[PDB]
């Protein structure tokens, strides 16, 4: 078949909803095994600075015990039967689900339901996750790449919700309680903030009809006075440079605002980011490759690696690249990486567009190989658009992308706008903020 | 002297706001003024004392330079 007859036979995810507001949805496939979770609009964005870290705290808790199953009996119920329990939280989104033998997914359904709706929170877990915490807040300062996107947030959102890192900060983790925390999820924790997402080789109506066994439950009205919604956040072009001369490499981020999830602009964004590309220095290409900023670094040996990256909040986002490179290669990515986003706002050719595109349309297949993949976007995907947008349709989007709409839409975002910067390590040669200004346009 | 050869520098956090999120005349009067006042209240003590010397030397010069052409000083 060509890839347009491929495009057609993914078999439509199917959507249901429960009395108090849950969403069930599931696509289908004959895969022996199966993922199966619990997607929820929670993250730091709804947290405010006094219970900022509940959300982190409570995936700490999340499988520690429930009233039903105490201490390790879920964690022994889970690997007896070989399944797999994972969890993550964003400043967003919150998802746990489980990896199982398709046959399992009733036993899987009933621990998700489990989990979300009956943990314990036993004051003596609480007390240990808090040590758990703090040590990951250490060894998350040894990470150049996580330390540069925190300070990202922090500056281009000042002021806002999305500043907030995830995690919290450290004195939050002493001091928030088990009252916090039952507080944060008697608010965020509500059947119509939920999506019950799964893929592989299961049926909708058995699906659907787990759920209603088991999160019929689950408070699906909350109030009135108590209904977490989210402001917008203002974004504002400034720049955090922390400078440490002893570290060995400068980890530099820079991004203007995006439009969020839901606008149409994201997938030629897409392609102009694809345009751009990514690099380190393993890559076979070198010399050769495509992207000007891929070859000019390769050859010149401007930076150990860099990448672009669209990251999406309800109405808002950050546009921009991360580059890594020696003390005295930072003016020269930078000089060359605004050359580009200027090269695409004014004269993105046909041929580029093209390239870019076909990138894209092999990142959006690739990407949802897997049980595991396919229902992260199942979840997220109800969350952001309340659909599941079909590949026919994602290609429809891309197709209608060409050169002049990629300098329209980089216009739009890139041009003479002001950007958010941010840089850690050996930084002595970070370029001025008016100086980067001047770049934009 | 280049940029990423000065010197060595570790630990500084440096927080900066783009031109055009920032007023270019911030307070320019409610404080402007006041901190005009205490830089030259500041200075005066070291910089006028000599000026005032020089005024008077002079105004006692041309004076005393009149009064010696006249015939009854
Ligand atoms: C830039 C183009 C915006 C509109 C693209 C819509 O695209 C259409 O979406 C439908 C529903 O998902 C699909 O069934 C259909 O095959 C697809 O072509």
């Known amino acids: ?49 006094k219970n900022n870290g509940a959300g982190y705290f409570v995936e700490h808790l999340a499988f520690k015990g429930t009233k039903n199953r105490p201490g390790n009996a879920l964690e022994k119920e889970v690997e007896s039967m070989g399944a797999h329990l994972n969890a993550y939280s964003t400043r ?53 790449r996580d330390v540069v996107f925190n300070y990202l947030h922090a500056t281009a959102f000042q002021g806002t919700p999305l500043a907030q890192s995830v995690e919290g900060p450290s004195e939050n983790v002493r001091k928030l309680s088990r ?42 009205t909350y109030d009135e006075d108590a209904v977490p919604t989210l402001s917008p956040c203002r974004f504002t072009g400034s720049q955090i440079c922390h400078r440490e001369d002893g570290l060995p490499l400068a980890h530099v981020a820079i991004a203007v605002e995006g439009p969020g999830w839901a606008h149409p602009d994201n997938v030629a964004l897409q392609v102009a980011n694809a345009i751009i590309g990514h690099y380190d220095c393993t890559y076979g290409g070198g010399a050769h490759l495509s992207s000007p900023l891929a070859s000019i670094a390769a050859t010149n040996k ?47 050719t046909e041929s580029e567009v093209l390239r870019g595109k076909n990138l894209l349309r092999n990142a959006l297949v690739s990407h949802l190989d897997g049980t595991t993949p396919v229902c992260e976007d199942i979840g997220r995907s109800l969350l952001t658009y309340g659909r599941r947008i079909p590949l026919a349709e994602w290609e429809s989007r891309i197709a209608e992308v060409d050169a002049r709409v990629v300098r329209e839409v980089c216009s739009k975002y890139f041009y003479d706008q002001c950007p958010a910067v941010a840089g850690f390590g050996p930084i002595e040669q970070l370029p001025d903020y008016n100086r980067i200004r001047s770049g934009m346009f | 002297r280049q940029f990423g050869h000065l010197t060595r520098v570790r630990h500084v956090i440096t927080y900066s706001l783009s031109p055009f999120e920032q007023r270019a005349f911030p307070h320019y009067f409610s404080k402007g003024i006041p901190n005009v006042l205490r ?35």
């Open chain 1, 92 to 144: 967003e989104h919150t998802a746990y689900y489980i990896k199982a033998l398709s046959k399992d997914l009733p036993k899987a359904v009933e621990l998700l339901a489990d989990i979300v709706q009956n943990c314990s929170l036993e004051d003596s877990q609480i007390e240990k996750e808090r040590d758990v915490i703090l040590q990951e807040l250490q060894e998350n300062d040894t990470s150049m």
């Open chain 1, 179 to 220: 009252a916090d925390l039952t507080e944060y999820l008697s608010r965020h924790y509500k059947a119509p903030r939920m999506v019950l997402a799964a893929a592989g080789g299961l049926e909708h109506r058995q699906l659907l009809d787990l759920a209603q066994k088991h999160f019929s439950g689950l408070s699906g």
């Open chain 1, 302 to 348: 401007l930076c150990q690696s860099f990448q672009t990256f669209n990251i999406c909040y309800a109405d808002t986002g950050l546009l921009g690249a991360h580059f890594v490179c020696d003390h005295m290669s930072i003016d020269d990515m930078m000089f060359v990486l605004q050359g580009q986003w200027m090269r695409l706002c004014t004269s993105a």
């Open chain 2, 39 to 73: 830089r030259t209240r500041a200075c005066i003590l070291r910089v006028a004392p000599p000026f005032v010397a020089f005024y008077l030397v002079y105004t006692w010069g041309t004076q005393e330079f009149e009064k010696s052409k006249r015939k009854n000083p």
């Open chain 1, 1 to 49: 078949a060509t890839y347009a007859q491929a495009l057609q036979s993914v078999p439509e995810t199917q959507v249901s909803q429960l009395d108090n507001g849950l969403r069930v949805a599931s696509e289908q496939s004959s895969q022996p095994t199966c993922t199966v979770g619990v997607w929820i609009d929670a993250g730091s964005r709804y947290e405010s600075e």
